[PDB]
Design a protein around this ligand. Sequence first.
Ligand SMILES: *[C@@H]1O[C@H](CO)[C@@H](O[C@@H]2O[C@H](CO)[C@@H](O)[C@H](O)[C@H]2NC(C)=O)[C@H](O)[C@H]1NC(C)=O
Ligand SMILES: *[C@@H]1O[C@H](CO)[C@@H](O)[C@H](O)[C@H]1NC(C)=O
Ligand SMILES: *[C@@H]1O[C@H](CO)[C@@H](O)[C@H](O)[C@H]1NC(C)=O
Ligand SMILES: [Ca+2]
Ligand SMILES: [Ca+2]
Lengths: 213, 230, 58, 57, 127
Amino acid sequence: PVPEGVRLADGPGHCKGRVEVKHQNQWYTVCQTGWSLRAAKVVCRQLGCGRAVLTQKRCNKHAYGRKPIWLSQMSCSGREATLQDCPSGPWGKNTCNHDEDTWVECEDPFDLRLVGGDNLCSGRLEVLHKGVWGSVCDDNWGEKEDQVVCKQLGCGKSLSPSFRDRKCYGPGVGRIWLDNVRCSGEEQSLEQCQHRFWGFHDCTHQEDVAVIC
Amino acid sequence: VFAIPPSFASIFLTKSTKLTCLVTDLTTYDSVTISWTRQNGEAVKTHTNISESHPNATFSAVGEASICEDDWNSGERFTCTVTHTDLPSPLKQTISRPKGVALHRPDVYLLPPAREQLNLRESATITCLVTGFSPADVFVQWMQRGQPLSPEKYVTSAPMPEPQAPGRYFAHSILTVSEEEWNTGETYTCVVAHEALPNRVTERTVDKSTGKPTLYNVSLVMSDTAGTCY
Amino acid sequence: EQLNLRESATITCLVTGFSPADVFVQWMQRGQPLSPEKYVTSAPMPEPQAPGRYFAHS
Amino acid sequence: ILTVSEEEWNTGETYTCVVAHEALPNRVTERTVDKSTGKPTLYNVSLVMSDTAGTCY
Amino acid sequence: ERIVLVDNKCKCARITSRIIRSSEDPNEDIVERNIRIIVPLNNRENISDPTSPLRTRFVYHLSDLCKKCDPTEVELDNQIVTATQSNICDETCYTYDRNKCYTAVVPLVYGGETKMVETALTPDACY
Ligand SMILES: *[C@@H]1O[C@H](CO)[C@@H](O[C@@H]2O[C@H](CO)[C@@H](O)[C@H](O)[C@H]2NC(C)=O)[C@H](O)[C@H]1NC(C)=O
Ligand SMILES: *[C@@H]1O[C@H](CO)[C@@H](O)[C@H](O)[C@H]1NC(C)=O
Ligand SMILES: *[C@@H]1O[C@H](CO)[C@@H](O)[C@H](O)[C@H]1NC(C)=O
Ligand SMILES: [Ca+2]
Ligand SMILES: [Ca+2]
């Protein structure tokens, strides 16, 4: 029972689709009796595709064609990284129903691009929560946010500028994905900072923030 | 006899539409027919997915068929034929989705436990008052600190019609927590799922600190030079 | 919120912790009973933490 | 210094002074006064704290 | 232990709630509600229009302050769904907000150009 990889195919996206499984070149697919969201939280963690959103045990019309049902049973906690960290004891135990397949709609992961500037290390901030790129707001912006986003950018440390280059690097246009983002200084990236809900902003596009480092 | 439909509880929590009829052990039969037949006539195959485990327990099984298409949401005359040679009359049951029921959003009210109840210092009953929903089926789950509470902690009633309203229903959900949890100020959130809700789920939270206050202390600082808030 | 919406108020009687499942709940406004259409009482259901006690809300 | 008639000041009519200067951020700063703003002899504040006993999470 | 119930910086109302651990018995601990409201004595009715008349009546619907119309996420067994936190909603702004900078546009004439330049109604807000 070695799940090397669990690809997501037959779906609109790279990591939105049905769950497969790979062992010893045999591409196989997984049914499960207890197939919760935490299993998808594992599955879109070992692939590194965002947080897990939806986990449908949704059947389709029978002419799809499908691989057989994976031999072991996979029930675990969900806080772990890969499909090897939790046990898959009952090998050869196929107690799914007749013709069904699972489905995961985990998010595309957080790609963060500093746009509008001459270099990629200096520009207005733009983030990717959904498929649409969008800026973030400067409500209660702090130097902890600057050092967190520069740590995630992999581009050194902030210098805390005098706001003139940030106002000169562009107002931007589009949508504002984040407002009132608040980083504690220790988070690896911008998702793990406290913020208002994605896309719910009380600011216009004139308040798009820029981080210089 | 029973044929439990997928409600909005089974639709939303599990994301799997399972047609289920329960064949109680009236008499032991070898080839128990729990064949879930469509109005079209094709049968999505189910057989003994879980035993009934009734007090008699004489060859009783539950057949759950995953007709998970849009044909249930649109609607069809689905029939499981509980036809048996023992008691030779076929004790079948037919269930369909109820058609054209008007959709009104639930107004969800979270009632804190009574002051009379906390004086006993034994248990606190938090009431989730889901009322005003005209489609009958509703799913109510309690969470504390973002973790789903166990279903033995809370008990939710069947929806019954609201008295003054014509066809709108109401439901309760009584969460029985110990008094030392509620008096320390622990947030108990009522997650309720309904079709007529815009985001499909409403979360009311209650705790002692929000509650009903027993000492408002207001300070209307009328300052000339306020201008911007600080 | 119910009084804030200004169309309806629902006073809930929470009969809980009773062992035989035989409770009759009726409401009086000022000592005389309201009509049974105005209130609705749920059936006695098992209180889950207590072993055999029941509860009912009206 | 701006000289206006006396009944013009007592009927509201908020006068705004705008400046134009190099060191200013948007090059323009505006301040206003009227009868009720500049050194008034009356403060007609009518606070209405409605619905404070009603719902707040 | 003053948990911040609202921190509305547009009407300046701050509401904070605490359980005062007053007595030994855990019931008479008073749920204390601290409404702190700053009333701008000279701000106009429309803050973004500096020529607006003086704001005299300051009405604060405290239910409108305490509404939470940002949908939150909840974790179900099979799904993460956005969850509405109130039934109220489906803005006067007595005071300016510190984080928000408000600009008004004035008609500036020199030789009849009427170049409409935006001011800063709140300086040291977007500098
Ligand atoms: C408050 O004042 C602002 C600024 O004068 C008003 O905004 C302008 O309103 C006019 C008429 O509605 C529009 O033609 C302009 O395009 C607006 N400008 C801006 C920058 O928004 C606003 O309408 C006023 N609000 C109230 C309630 O009086
Ligand atoms: C004071 O405010 C009240 C509020 O309605 C208003 O009716 C009254 O005319 C005001 N009086 C003055 C002198 O501004
Ligand atoms: C309410 O009372 C507390 C004392 O417990 C005090 O510190 C606080 O300032 C009061 N609230 C306001 C708004 O003044
Ligand atoms: Ca904000
Ligand atoms: Ca801002």
